[PDB]
From a paper:
The Microrchidia (MORC) family of chromatin-remodelling ATPases is pivotal in forming higher-order chromatin structures that suppress transcription. All MORCs share three features: an N-terminal gyrase, heat shock protein 90, histidine kinase and MutL (GHKL) [name] domain, a central CW-type zinc finger (CW) domain, and a divergent C-terminal domain (CTD) with predicted coiled coils (CCs). [name] possesses multiple DNA-binding sites that undergo structural rearrangement upon DNA binding.
We performed electrophoretic mobility shift assay (EMSA) with MORC2WT and MORC21-603 in the presence of IRDye-700 labelled 10, 14, 19, 24, 29, 34, 39, 44, 60 and 90 bp double-stranded (dsDNA). Both constructs of [name] bind to dsDNA longer than 29 bp. Interestingly, almost all CC1 was missing in the DNA-bound cryoEM structures indicating high flexibility of this region upon DNA binding. Upon overlaying these models, we observed no conformational changes within the [name] domain. In MORC21-603, we observed a significant increase in deuterium uptake in the ATP lid upon DNA binding (peptides 81 to 109), indicating an increased flexibility in the ATP lid region. The presence of DNA with MORC1-603 also reduced deuterium uptake in CC1 and nearby regions, transducer-like and CW. This suggests CC1 and nearby regions form a high-affinity DNA binding site, somewhat consistent with previous mutagenesis of the CC1 loop (point mutation of R326, R329 and R333) that prevented DNA binding. The observed flexibility of CC1 inferred from its absence in the DNA-bound [name] cryoEM structures and crosslinking mass spectrometry, suggests that CC1 may aid in binding and compacting DNA.
Numbering used by the authors:
A (entry chain B): 1 to 288, 365 to 510, 519 to 528, 534 to 551
B (entry chain A): 5 to 288, 365 to 514, 519 to 551
The structure:
């Protein structure tokens, strides 16, 4: 469309320090990790394995590896990775979470100094090496990223510039944890399917005490934050397992941390007397309703608040709205969930907030109004608040104190919330009337049975 | 040699991506204000040039008299991450080489920057409209330089300069070299910068996100003021007033100076609690100033500054987290050096959440210490507050405007004021009727500090001790 040529004009160029600048957006390391998990999901990965390869010769002592069997990346897609702001996912009606062409870079540079990405597709295996260590050691102001490609069957380099490929592979072997083509190929074989991605973030960030920010020792099945948990802390904020469990409102991709599947869950289904309220979005209709799902978290009443999902991705968690902002038990314990499309509210640079604060607060006020409506609809006054709560084992006067673990109260709580579960093979969510490692439809029903989704009672506002 | 290797390159959409970090449009503006400050500007004028042919209806202009930029610096503007400010023992607020771009792209589609210095005047045109209209996936930024004396182009590629100026005239609000030179002459001094963000963002209702009509002396958010909303979040005037813990640069919004203030000076019974941050020495201490906001009890909470720049404000810590009135109304201030905590991408949070929470817990402990020290609750918190005019029970209601109360409050808080000539912060002994006028040192009744050469008497804040 340009009327002339702009080859001689200056271009806005990235610098090695802008990688750290980009990383600083993640005050939530779990958001930084969620960026890679979102990339894996958008890659149509059926599972993402988030494990740690111990490496004492690397800062932090271990590499953080995100292995997914998604669509992978061809050489052109891998090149487009380092095209900041480029996102083929940013398309109308897209269900993909990536739109900013920035999540992978920001999250990886927040988690660790460098990240080496191995991706595989139809007939090509590409390694993307974003080595901040390389830049620091060689005084590179630009952001140079080797992108060697091999033929996935012959392992022969697929390139037009042999010298370019040689330099790329030499840099990878020199500054990466994989010092030989044999090690590079070994990391490529960790993608067993025809396509998949293996994002390895190494030289992790260290706290002031020299230890990594991510604690993987206190719980080998979890990636925790290396920091003492005050009773007021939220598992989704101190435990990456808990965070990834509710990281998506419609979790299809399985998430494994250190080889142990994360029991992904739908708060829409894990609640007592859930109810959907339709809210008409003037912005949504102008650019084209929302579904405010409310329910009492009987299992843990202190883990209440609104869980705002944006394009099925968790942005705001435990967001207190409506009467919850007051001092009192009114609407205490009620959990709200909403999947906000991108036409309504877009996420922030770190995808831990919403760019349009005005409309985000409008949504929060609407959700508070609907939360009060839900509280009236369930009409706990018909029962009474204290009697209602102690019915589920909350005998203690304390609010954050978990309910008594008597089998009576356990059955009382469980009898109301159906125990949904995802099949490890067909990825569909099932139900049972009345497991950590694995489960399939046959263990009630079969993998071909249509997904009988949770139909929620519909309420109305006013 | 790595000339053959791929380079991580920016894309036009990355401008919006970078902009999305600013969920606080006032933080987006504060980015440009911080750039002006770092430029050693003694004055930044944040005015609105009405332009109905541009999206938003008006142009947002940030005119400063700082050091300006030479052609090399202007080129380094579009080098994302490039920041010469990022140096040790540096009072500069810029470190990320990103603030200008993120803030400008959050505020509006495009921004045209006019900077002047030694005899070279440079115009940086980051036109997202240009890229949208001509299908550029890159980020092409014209950077023509003229000789500030002869206004003759200073360039090596005449065709490059011609293309740059053509793009500026074609996609910018200034369609002629005459208009460009007018905007350059808006920098009267030998050096200065004029950042004009135009094609502003529009809310759903089609109006700009910034309200410059409700109060012609302020840049408000075009959105109602819920009682809970803070002036620093609905009024850029107040936000810029408390935007720096040590304000030197004068902020003028629409031509009217912003009455910059130091909460340290503007508090009752201020006390400096020194906190020895182990992180400071580990990465190699802080000063937690606490005071009761007698004028506005509800405007309490910690005001955490980072390198003299406001990051977190009204941050409830310590007993304030409890619903009780303990430590209610106490404002806290801390200028966190960059060595201790660094800010987030948007400069509205802190990158190290763990250590930021450690600092918040320390500030809460020191806040309880200050509460006990002043012993106002010991003598009776309700009577203490109603003595200053809060005879009512609602914590959000302001104090009674009776002159008796007004005097009771103003007596405790000494009145400080900045001279509009030497930028030195003077303190006066009696109540002042006055918006910020053109007050200068010469008009100070106190003879010890009736001069612009008189040394600035810094505040003699008492130093408390913890434990
Ligand atoms: N695991 C993966 N599998 C397949 N493609 C991937 C993977 N990770 C990254 N990519 C590709 O690389 C691009 C850049 O990643 P990223 O920096 O996360 O930007 P984005 O995902 O497009 N958008 P956002 O997540 O909103 O910043 C993606 O958009 C994908 O095209
Ligand atoms: N008003 C100004 N006066 C002088 N120099 C300026 C001005 N605005 C920008 N610059 C220069 O342009 C650079 C880029 O600005 P910016 O994108 O704000 O990055 P930064 O200010 O270096 N760091 P940060 O503000 O933390 O992102 C600055 O660092 C200055 O060198
Ligand atoms: Mg992504
Ligand atoms: Mg700046
Ligand atoms: Zn199945
Ligand atoms: Zn003076």
């Amino acid at each position: 469309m340009a009327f002339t040529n702009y080859s001689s004009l200056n271009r806005a160029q990235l610098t090695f320090e802008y990688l750290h600048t980009n990383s600083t957006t993640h005050e939530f390391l779990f958001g930084a990790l969620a960026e890679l998990v979102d990339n894996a999901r958008d890659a149509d990965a059926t599972r993402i394995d988030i494990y740690a390869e111990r490496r004492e010769d690397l800062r932090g002592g271990f590499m953080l590896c995100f292995l997914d069997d998604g669509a992978g990346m061809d050489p052109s897609d891998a090149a487009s990775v380092i095209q900041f702001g480029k996102s083929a996912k940013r398309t109308p009606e897209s269900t993909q979470i990536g739109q900013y062409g920035n999540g992978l870079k920001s999250g990886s540079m927040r988690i660790g100094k460098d990240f080496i990405l191995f991706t595989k597709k139809e007939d090509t295996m590409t390694c993307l090496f974003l080595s901040r260590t390389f830049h620091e050691e060689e005084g590179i102001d630009e952001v140079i990223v080797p992108l060697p490609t091999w033929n996935a069957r012959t392992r022969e380099p697929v390139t037009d510039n042999v010298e370019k490929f040689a330099i790329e592979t030499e840099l990878i072997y020199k500054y990466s944890p994989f010092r030989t083509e044999e090690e590079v190929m070994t990391q490529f074989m960790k993608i067993p399917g025809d396509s998949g991605t293996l994002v390895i973030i190494f030289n992790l960030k260290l706290m002031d005490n020299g230890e990594p920010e991510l604690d993987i020792i206190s719980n080998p099945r979890d990636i925790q934050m290396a920091e003492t948990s005050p009773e007021g802390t939220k598992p989704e904020r101190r435990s990456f397992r808990a965070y990834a469990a509710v990281l998506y409102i419609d979790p299809r991709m399985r998430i494994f941390i250190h080889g142990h599947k994360v029991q992904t869950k739908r708060l829409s289904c894990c609640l007592y007397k859930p109810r959907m309220y339709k809210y008409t979005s003037s912005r949504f209709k102008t650019r084209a309703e929302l579904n405010f799902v409310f329910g009492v978290n009987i299992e843990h009443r202190d883990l209440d608040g609104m869980f705002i999902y944006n394009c099925s991705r968790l942005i705001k968690m435990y967001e207190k709205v409506g009467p919850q902002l007051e001092g009192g038990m009114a609407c205490g314990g009620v959990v709200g969930v909403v999947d906000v499309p991108y036409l309504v509210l877009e996420p922030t640079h770190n995808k831990q907030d919403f760019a349009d604060a005005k409309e985000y607060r409008h949504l929060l006020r609407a959700m508070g109004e609907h939360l009060a409506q839900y509280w009236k609809d369930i009409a706990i006054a018909q029962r009474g608040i204290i009697k209602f709560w102690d019915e589920f084992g909350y005998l203690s006067a304390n609010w954050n104190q978990p309910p008594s673990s008597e089998l009576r109260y356990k059955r009382r709580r469980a009898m109301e919330i159906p125990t949904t579960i995802q099949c490890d093979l067909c990825l569909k969510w099932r139900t049972l009337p009345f497991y950590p490692d694995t489960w399939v439809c046959s263990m009630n029903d079969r993998c071909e049975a249509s997904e009988q989704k949770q139909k929620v009672p519909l309420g109305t506002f006013r």
